[PDB]
């Protein structure tokens, strides 16, 4: 007696949000890549992050066309697999690029003389290779399982995960629970903990070395502390809603809710993903276009 329905304005505003983040993320990350390529340290992480975000968002018109037509998929099994694998590998790679930036900034700012060989040893192209290979290998179950099939309930095609290619219908629940908790851990708990810790130590050093006696040091102190807390809080407010509603839905199998909290989760999930996509649009204006020299390089390699 709790057949989960949807919201009527969702079917019209979710493709709208998808197209909004499409235009914004594609334009911003295209600008970031255009400057960083067609013009120092942290440039490789900026470029890898912009590629992650641009490939993250650039396949979204497919899902906007998929949701506009009430969950019908006129693109094929291969486009389902490729778009899903790209979305997943780029979620992983973007959070890993944010974490690699945080760790490189820790190695450079907090203890910069002692950690001088380590950052030339485990940061830069090495770190981007490791994180991109790791993102590609951690998203493979989405490549294998994501398939298109007409569940008889709609007389239409859907891009859904199989769990029959890997498990039985009596054993699918363990599979999606394990995969969901593993994705949550490896994509939001240890990378965000590393971001938090590295940025806490960077903020300790920024508070200890920029004195509040003279006004210029104070301006830079507030500027850097504010941008650090903004990076942290933006990552949190953009990814924690998604992982929170996802783990709550997964727990839904355990302590089942009155089906109305579960209806709430199912209806609000698309907006949690739409918020996750806002991180990809904000990343330029926080990591790349926050460096005024980068901004002038941009507006001079256009104008």
């Amino acid at each position: 007696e709790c057949e989960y329905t949807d919201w009527k304005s969702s079917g019209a505003l979710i493709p709208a949000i998808y197209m909004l983040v499409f235009l914004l993320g594609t334009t911003g990350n295209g600008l970031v890549l255009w400057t960083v390529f067609r013009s120092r340290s942290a440039d490789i992480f900026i470029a890898s992050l912009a590629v992650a975000d641009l490939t993250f968002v650039v396949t979204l018109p497919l899902w906007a066309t998929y949701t506009y037509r009430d969950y019908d998929w006129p693109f094929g099994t291969f486009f389902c697999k490729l778009s899903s694998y790209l979305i997943f590998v780029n979620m992983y790679a973007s959070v890993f690029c944010l974490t690699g930036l945080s760790f490189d900034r820790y190695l450079a700012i907090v203890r910069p003389v002692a950690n001088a060989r380590l950052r030339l040893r485990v940061s830069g192209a090495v770190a981007t290779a490791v994180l991109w290979v790791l993102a590609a290998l951690l998203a493979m179950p989405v490549m294998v399982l994501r398939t298109t099939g007409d569940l008889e309930n709609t007389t239409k095609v859907q891009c859904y995960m199989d769990y029959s290619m890997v498990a039985t219908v009596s054993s699918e629940w363990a599979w999606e629970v394990g995969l969901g908790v593993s994705s949550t851990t490896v994509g939001f708990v240890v990378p965000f903990t590393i971001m938090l810790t590295c940025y806490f130590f960077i903020a300790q050093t920024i508070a200890g070395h920029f004195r509040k006696e003279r006004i210029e040091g104070l301006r830079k102190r507030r500027r850097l502390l504010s941008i650090i807390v903004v990076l942290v809080v933006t990552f949190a407010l953009c990814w924690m809603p998604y992982h929170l509603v996802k783990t709550l839905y997964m727990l839904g199998s355990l302590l089942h809710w009155p089906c109305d909290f579960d209806l709430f989760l199912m209806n609000i999930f698309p907006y949690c993903t739409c918020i996750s996509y806002v991180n990809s649009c904000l990343n330029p204006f926080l990591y790349a276009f926050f460096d005024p020299r980068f901004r002038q390089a941009c507006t001079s390699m256009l104008c």
Partner: peptide, 14 residues
């Protein structure tokens, strides 16, 4: 996949 948000969008599990 038994639940009803496996499809209807990306953002799947691992």
């Amino acid at each position: 996949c038994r639940p009803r948000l496996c499809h209807k969008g990306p953002x799947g599990p691992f």
